Amino acid sequence: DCHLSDMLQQLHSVNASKPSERGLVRQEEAEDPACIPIFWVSKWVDYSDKYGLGYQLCDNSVGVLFNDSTRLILYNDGDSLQYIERDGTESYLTVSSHPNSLMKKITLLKYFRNYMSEHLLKAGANITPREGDELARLPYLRTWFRTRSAIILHLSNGSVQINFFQDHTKLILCPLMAAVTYIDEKRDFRTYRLSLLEEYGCCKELASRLRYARTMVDKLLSS
């Protein structure tokens, strides 16, 4: 995985600079709004006892990564679908086209969408994502896992998101922007160029989350 290997080097690099051990830390100088992601996971539901993991992206599209490792993505138009086999083979359809083999997985995706709409808050709700151009497209969830401290969400556009359980802080790392968006415990959303975080330093909070991230990316690469 090219994206993951780049991301591992970026994180090894920023951690190696020990960005929180400085006389002057000026984290705000490493902030770059041109680096804001196009997509992140807004809501998620782990029902992997029975079906798999449902999620919502910040655009209101929803997806499910089923226990058979297939995904079904419903776009924010409420109709257009993308189906991905275990091997990454993608199909493009619509609900209204009525694909017999998908009808049940579509019902299930609809029960996830409803659940999340009813009950869950939209992470990064106030935030405008960057406008994607013709080189980017809507990603699916390639894989995920939970540790005792977080859920780790790996999207097909190379982004890795990590949502921390006890404090509700979140990271969105993109290896192409080589950036990290940190959602802090006040729900402030800020995006940093990782290379500038090496230059200007960062808080102990963010630095410690970035060490954690490096470890989780190592876990993603092994598997």
Binding site: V45, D46, Y47, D49, H119, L121, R146, I151
Partner: peptide, 7 residues
């Protein structure tokens, strides 16, 4: 189930 942050 387990879920992200509720309302």
């Amino acid at each position: 189930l387990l879920c992200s942050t509720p309302n």
